C-alpha cells in the first residue's frame, strides 16, 4: 500500500482556503493588479536610467542606440511582466 500516501493529508477543523477556487481567484487577480502597477513603475525607472547614462557617457564611449537599448528594455519589461503573470497563475491554479 505505497500508493495510499497520495491521499496523505492532515486537515484541521477548517479546510484550507486554497481548496476554494474563489479565494485563489481573489489572490490571483490581486497579484494581477499588483503586477500591472509594477509594469508601469518599471517603465518609469527605465525612462530615468535612459537619460541617466546619457549624462555619464563620455564621447570615446560607443553611441548608445536609444532605439536599440530602449527596445530590448521595453520588450523585456513585457516578457518579464507576462512571465510574472503565468508564475502567479502557477502558484494559485497549478501548484498551490
Amino acid at each position: 500500500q505505497g500508493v495510499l500516501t497520495t491521499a496523505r493529508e492532515k486537515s484541521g477543523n477548517f479546510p484550507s482556503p486554497l481548496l476554494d477556487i474563489k479565494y485563489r481567484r481573489r489572490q490571483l487577480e490581486l497579484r494581477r493588479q499588483q503586477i500591472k502597477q509594477w509594469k508601469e513603475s518599471e517603465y518609469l525607472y527605465l525612462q530615468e536610467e535612459v537619460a541617466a547614462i546619457k549624462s555619464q557617457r563620455s564621447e570615446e564611449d560607443g553611441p548608445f542606440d536609444e532605439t536599440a537599448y530602449l527596445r530590448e528594455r521595453t520588450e523585456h519589461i513585457e516578457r518579464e511582466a507576462r512571465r510574472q503573470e503565468a508564475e502567479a497563475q502557477t502558484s494559485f491554479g497549478n501548484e498551490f
Binding site: 500500500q1 495510499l4 500516501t5 491521499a7 496523505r8 493529508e9
Partner: peptide, 29 residues
Amino acid sequence: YEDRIQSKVFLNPQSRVTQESNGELKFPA
C-alpha cells in the same frame, strides 16, 4: 511503525518518528 498504525502513518503527512526507550526510531502509537 507497528502494523496496526500503518494506514494512519501513511496518511498523516506530519507523522514523524520519535526517539524511543531503547534508542530505536519508531513511529509513536
